[PDB]
Symmetry: C5
Subunit: 38 residues, 5 copies
């Protein structure tokens, strides 16, 4: 009922989650941009 259950397994979620997004932006941009320019 009380708060403070787990944090170790939580902080890992955001860390790995941001990696997936930060990759999509650099890879997706390169594909769309490279196709337009070239």
């Amino acid at each position: 009922m009380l708060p403070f259950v787990q944090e170790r397994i939580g902080l890992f979620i955001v860390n790995f989650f941001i990696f997936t997004v930060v990759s999509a932006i650099t890879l997706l941009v390169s594909m769309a941009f490279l196709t337009a320019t070239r």
Copy 2:
């Protein structure tokens, strides 16, 4: 009155919040850039 109430529900806010921004930058840039180039 004392601090330390909840952290689990907090760390999730930033995680999901950054996802929305990191997406807007890659999608918004692609739209404006692709239109200019093409």
Copy 3:
């Protein structure tokens, strides 16, 4: 004197702080790039 005072109000700082930066990069880049290309 002892550590562990507040974390809830802290984690919110980085969350909102990153939003301001991630916006400047997408908006600033679009302005400089769009002007050069167009």
Copy 4:
């Protein structure tokens, strides 16, 4: 068995981990883009 073991060494993982990604996006994009444009 109980939760809450370590957080100091954890928060450092994401901090340093994001640095490696945020660098790959700016360096990788510059290489692919600069080659196409030039």
Copy 5:
């Protein structure tokens, strides 16, 4: 010997650290890209 020493001063490291990187990517990209295009 036991864990849990400080977190307030830690969470601030990543917050300020990411700012320095997120700036280098937008400023470095603008310099290299603007020079190539223009």
